[PDB]
Symmetry: D3
Subunit: 306 residues, 6 copies
Amino acid sequence: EPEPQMVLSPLTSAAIFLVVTIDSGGEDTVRDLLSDVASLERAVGFRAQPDGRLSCVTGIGSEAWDRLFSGARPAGLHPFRELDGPVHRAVATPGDLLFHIRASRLDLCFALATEIMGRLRGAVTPQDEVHGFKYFDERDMLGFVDGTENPTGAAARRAVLVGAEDPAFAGGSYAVVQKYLHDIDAWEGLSVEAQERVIGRRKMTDVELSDDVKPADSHVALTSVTGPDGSDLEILRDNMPFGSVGREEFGTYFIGYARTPEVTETMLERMFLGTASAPHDRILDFSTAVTGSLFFTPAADFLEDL
Amino acid sequence: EPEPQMVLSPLTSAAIFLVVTIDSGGEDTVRDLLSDVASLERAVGFRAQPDGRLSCVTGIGSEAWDRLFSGARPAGLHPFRELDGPVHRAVATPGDLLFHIRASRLDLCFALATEIMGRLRGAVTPQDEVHGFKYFDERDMLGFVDGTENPTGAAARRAVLVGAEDPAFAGGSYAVVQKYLHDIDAWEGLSVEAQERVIGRRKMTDVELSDDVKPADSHVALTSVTGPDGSDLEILRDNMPFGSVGREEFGTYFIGYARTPEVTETMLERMFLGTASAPHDRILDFSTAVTGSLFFTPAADFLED
Amino acid sequence: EPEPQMVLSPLTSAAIFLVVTIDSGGEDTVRDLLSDVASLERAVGFRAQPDGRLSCVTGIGSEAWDRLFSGARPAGLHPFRELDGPVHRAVATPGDLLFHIRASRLDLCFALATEIMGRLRGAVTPQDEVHGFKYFDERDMLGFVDGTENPTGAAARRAVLVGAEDPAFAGGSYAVVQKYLHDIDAWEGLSVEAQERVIGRRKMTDVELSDDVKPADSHVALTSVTGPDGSDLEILRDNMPFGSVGREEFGTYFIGYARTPEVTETMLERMFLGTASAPHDRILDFSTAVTGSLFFTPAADFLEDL
Amino acid sequence: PEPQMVLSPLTSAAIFLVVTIDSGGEDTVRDLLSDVASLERAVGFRAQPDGRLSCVTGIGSEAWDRLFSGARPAGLHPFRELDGPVHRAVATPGDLLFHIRASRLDLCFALATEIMGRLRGAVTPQDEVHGFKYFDERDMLGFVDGTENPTGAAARRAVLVGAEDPAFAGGSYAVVQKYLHDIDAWEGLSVEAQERVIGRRKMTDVELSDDVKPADSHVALTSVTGPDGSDLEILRDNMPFGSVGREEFGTYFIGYARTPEVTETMLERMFLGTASAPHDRILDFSTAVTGSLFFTPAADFLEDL
Amino acid sequence: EPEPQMVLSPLTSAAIFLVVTIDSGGEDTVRDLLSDVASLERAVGFRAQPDGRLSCVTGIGSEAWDRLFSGARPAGLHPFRELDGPVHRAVATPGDLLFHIRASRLDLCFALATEIMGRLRGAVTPQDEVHGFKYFDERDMLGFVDGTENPTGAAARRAVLVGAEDPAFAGGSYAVVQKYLHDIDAWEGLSVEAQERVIGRRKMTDVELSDDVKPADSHVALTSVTGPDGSDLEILRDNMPFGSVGREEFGTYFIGYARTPEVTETMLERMFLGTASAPHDRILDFSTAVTGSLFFTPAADFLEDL
Amino acid sequence: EPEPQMVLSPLTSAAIFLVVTIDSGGEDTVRDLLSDVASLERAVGFRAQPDGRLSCVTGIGSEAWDRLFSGARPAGLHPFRELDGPVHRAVATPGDLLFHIRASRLDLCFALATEIMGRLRGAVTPQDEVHGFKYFDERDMLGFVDGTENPTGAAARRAVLVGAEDPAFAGGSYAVVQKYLHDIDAWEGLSVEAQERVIGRRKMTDVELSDDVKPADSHVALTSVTGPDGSDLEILRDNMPFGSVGREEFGTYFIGYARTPEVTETMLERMFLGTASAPHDRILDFSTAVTGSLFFTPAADFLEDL
Ligand code: HEM
Ligand code: HEM
Ligand code: HEM
Ligand code: HEM
Ligand SMILES: [Mg+2]
């Protein structure tokens, strides 16, 4: 093997998502930070073992990749593709670097973020900063259990990590982020039965709706895709609520990892553009994307060796 | 008689501080919410037992008190007094209601805050909202253990709850809030030994500096008051770090409860204005107050009506 | 002076309810056991400190009281009063002794029950034995949060413990038990909104329905009683699910403690017999009582001194 | 080739459900089997990572033949009755086994509910046992139960079908027996005597040395070596159960192995005895009232229907 | 009350017992430390709350009391009395100060002990230091559950704290310590039934032997003493195993608190000297006392103010 | 194939290190115990699942190897080599057997140590016995976080276990032990800044000093070693504080596992003998080694077959 980053992390209940762009002349400061980021993860986290579960995953955008490195590029790396649907729009916003920081406690996330941004002061410009918190029974902002169908164990390794198909970058992965804001008033206006039809599962028991009854414009319907293999195509998600009550913001921060962006991008097309039999994913009638960025999260050794 | 609000809460690691002003004509919506706030605390919290440790303490400002109620006022209740020191200034900022929401997990805090602000949409205007997190070994944003000398058990009851001296409002308390922002670059410029001289305790072990060596302008020096009888005057604090890395904000949200504001106010005068033998509290050379508000947190039964 | 039994126990996640009758000639064996029950609680429980939270509360029925003791009777003690409603019937079934055993683990409950029934074989006849468990996030078999409005701290002391009004028995309490079996098929036939109208609170969030909307034949409506005082009358409940999937039994084991049975019994009248404006508690359309018994749970010192 | 969760962590609660398939039920059963994996997730996922909910599904000999056609697991047959001179191991009906385990009973019960929900109509319950860990992994005879089970790779190799039956690799063979103990009789023995029945020390759980351990002790008769001299091992997860009302005290026995030959050798030695032992002394205080054998297929066999 | 020291501590699983004598001239250093010991307890412990449960109880001997303070003496304070029995001897060994430090983790105990001995370097001479650990189910070194019959709640307050009978020192208590070493080879030579006869309870289940079968020279027999009222006299114990495998030392560190030493001393006479009906406590045939000291543990305010 | 001993343990907060020598004639008794030591680990530890985390690692010295075993020797096994530096000295002390016993509680360690020494009483002579405890945030006796840079997962498998380079003993490891006693007075005389320069990392935050500020005589500097390969050479440490406040002993018990002793021995030469640009490791100016032994810890299978 090479060591991948902590893409397959345990259940964690807090996160910080940090997206930044690299200023003019920043490339050197950044390259230094990248070579140390693994050891900052350990500095902050080691002393909080073992309940801490602190991990930071670092990702790099398509344009940033070319400023920072020469040598070949990961096969799949490109700017996030805007999707201008008949009704709904998946936007593209700027981002050169992603830090996806996760732990059991927000303060650990904050301490690591402090250390990282400390080393980058001068060189970067923050584009997004989100402090996320999982609800107490793995629920998201819509009140549904979120994560149930994520792959685990060897299936997750298979779905998420670059392998032999791009051997130079094996152990890497492709992360897509989108920040969503929900219209909770609208959403709470539906009966539970109606909400279950939007999602495709039971609210309370989290059991899948039977095929004979699950709508084709339900979220679970549109994000189940079968490959040429006959194999189901899987991504790894770690959606996190965030918000502010004073400013009436209630959000879900989407992040999905896959071994090639083609998978993540297909699901997005289905959601925003629709299919043969579905105008668009009903979940977008209550959720607006306000960011969109795609990153490559290299193998851990790649970063070590600079 | 009285059940007080959850002023003496267990150690909790997350908080939301929500400060609002009441719009014109809002008084009725507010009065309804106050009668229900206890049962929202239970709705949201009960099912997360026993890890949850969700509590909300509700406080009311001096001007708001007059809008909402007639009858007596709590004897100590007045607007926060600005302190214009030689060097440092304690500001006074607007606030009619305080919700001091605490739990072991932030999401519980957020769920209760959602429900409360849900019932108040229309009637109020948010002034401040802070999501706080205690660092993993009870440390604050300056890296010091924060809370060590708070009173506990019976001493805390004695220090924090209104009693026979204002018997109409026994079970209540007086909360003072100040939001502080720190100059971290400045602070991290000091050696540990120097920082210990600012605070008055050892950084790593949290042992008090001995009397013979503790500076008189150290924080612990200026916030130790004895009353007339020689007995120490205590408050109960629950300071919480908060911040944002992107915008370089690193903060401590101060809240102190006391059975009369006279105590909290004296410590503040000493800090901002100085004494005989100290220009001001050295901690203010790294910490700037950008809010200041005083609230009365009534006994729980008072709100039930 | 007087030390009550562990009526105000912490949240515990397992229970055994044991109801027995005293055979002819059994009175002596029983009286010995009552003086020892506290020390068996310690024997079993002490070694599993402090996670264990094992408590046994012992209660005695009205006719059994006369067989066991002469001297004064607790003022409120009588046989459970059958309620023959127009539609629903609260039955009264035999029971001389109650052991309400609670802990964080079932095995501790079982161990204590073993020791107690060990000393009593010969003298008693088991009438009911239920092994109960917490569901999830304090939910009951109907899927609602169960316990939310129980009194706590000082208010609970005030509501549950006999005081100056019967000074001989101060520290005691009155327990009523009813075993309920639910018609789950029927219940799952309702929409959530319909179920919420039966109970009087929201299913998922456990927020009370406003007066503006709460039905008068909702369960929360009928079990809220105000005294002549204008003050609410409260009891302390510790309902436990129990069940068997093979026999389709899904149950709620109801137990309510109060300082006088008049309170518990009023709530029951309202539920079974109805009011001005409500035929009966809608919850009984999905719940059948198959036992009913009333006991006095003396102060702990009362039992010691035998 | 992924197996079912036969190697579970230590879990403190179990439900064992044994059912028979009614005539005409075969379709409803085959549908459920393809979904049982996704119900495990639906119910269990939200209680992670304490939950440790796992369901292992097994199929009986006759039922196999009603549900599927083509080739059979090499070792799958009806449980073989044992008519010893003193003790008898009976065979009872059972077409399907759900071995449901978690850190809490309610997760077990919730999954059992959803499964039987989908099968109401097609099947008839034969046995339903709610098991609990006692204290410190002790059983109803008061001895530590589990100590010599294989772990890690030794357990993979002892319990999963491999190259010797390639079509069914990933599978295992579960034998179940419900045992009731005569506790009165058992508590009549001194501890030293009880230790001679089991073959280990009661309080410390150290093995008796070979020069003192009886040949009719349980640990003696269930230690079996192969012709190659290596130990033949199974994986057990015995659960106490009972009812104090009915003076029923039980150990529900479940033993997984890569071939039933191993499990069946141990049973023959227990019930029928050896050269130098009439029968396992533990059977003088334990009566078997069920007996069933099931094959627990690889996970992908059930998914793909 | 005035505020007592933490005599009534929860179950904790580690302890350090530190016994020292005061050197000539040391009186001043000691008086300073006593006024600060409360705040050292908080310094060390606060940051590990609430898992920590660090408590230190400070006690002062008879002769030391006279060197340190003028004013009245606690009524019960005197040197531990050697008991020279026909067979077994309870020795008396020197000690001016006792620190009984307890927590859930040894390191917290050690940190506080380091701080205390740090301030006393110069002034004192260590006599005894034991690091104790609870065996995993509250068992002691002989394999029996140890602590079961200790009083709790109000009964414990009543049994251990000085009240109106010596009003000047209300909130105080009297601690006796004895370090015992066991003859494990001998002990393991007995059957369990024989050991149960030594102690007076069942080994595994921790149930008391019935009166009609419990020997009069069993430990539980000789340490059960009834006052004039017929009511039991109780102490509060927190025995801790300690040992060293290399040197074959297996020990029990005995500590008992009582509101008057007369109770603790009665139990000791019965154990060591015997009664009309018991030669001596059979436990002493497997246990040798190698220390013996008596201390007064004042109310916490007493230490605060000087 | 082969199963190693529990070299890679979880984080554990208690340990007993027991070093013994085999007396003449003891070799049979010792061979017996080695074949059972695996099953005593389970006897003691099984019932304390899953919190217990009891593990025993057994190591054998060079000379003992020769007395105990039939055929060939681990390639790297020799006597610990004394290091006679110009200022500091790494001594070599007797030790044939090592038991490295770890768990989440000291009592489990003690119970296993008891059972082991039980079987060996007669055949061996104790040289060293240390009861270690982790400070509450992975700190050592100098107040620095200790453990931070240890390897994890596959990196640790690679750096610690013998493989195909000595195939008869693959699954084994090489342990070096050294008991160090610190001069706390001296050490606490330094400012924190000075202490950080001795170690090479920050005291409070545990972040590494940047390369242009990190002294070459700092501990972290001298124990960072690259191989001829350009790769960093790693060991796995589990240093445990220990001590006695009475006797002013404050200690760090050093144990380092590696797949060859060459690595551990290189770091020691650098520490005690110095480099191009450093006299010796500054940490030795506050730490004195009083033991030194090297052992080989065979695969689990090796011991079972005896
Ligand atoms: C806008 C906010 C979003 C929310 C609140 C959300 C929520 C959920 C929920 C509640 C489920 C069902 C339970 C589960 O299996 O996790 C789910 C499933 C899923 N979501 Fe989303 N989701 C969101 C956006 C997205 C996006 C943008 C994608 C893909 C780009 C995605 C991909 C999936 C997939 C692949 C599944 C499961 C498919 C399967 O069941 O086989 N989600 N999501
Ligand atoms: C500016 C941000 C603040 C920070 C970061 C802070 C931090 C601390 C710290 C680290 C301690 C030592 C540990 C403890 O005993 O809690 C302390 C003690 C204390 N602080 Fe503050 N503090 C702040 C503001 C205030 C204010 C405004 C007041 C009063 C109005 C106050 C009152 C006290 C008191 C009374 C003590 C203890 C007195 C005694 O030691 O007996 N603090 N504070
Ligand atoms: C009837 C109730 C049973 C009880 C209470 C019981 C209890 C125990 C206990 C206490 C041990 C020693 C500790 C351990 O290794 O787990 C043990 C070992 C064992 N039992 Fe049982 N058992 C029962 C039935 C069975 C049956 C039916 C079988 C096999 C078909 C069996 C197979 C084993 C095996 C293979 C061992 C370990 C052998 C070794 O030490 O190398 N048990 N059992
Ligand atoms: C080696 C020393 C000792 C050991 C190992 C030991 C052990 C025990 C054990 C196992 C029990 C039974 C469980 C319990 O209720 O705690 C017990 C009870 C008791 N022990 Fe000890 N003990 C020792 C010394 C003492 C001493 C020196 C005293 C008194 C001065 C004492 C006083 C008691 C009392 C008062 C009881 C319970 C009385 C009642 O049973 O109602 N112990 N001890
Ligand atoms: Mg019987």
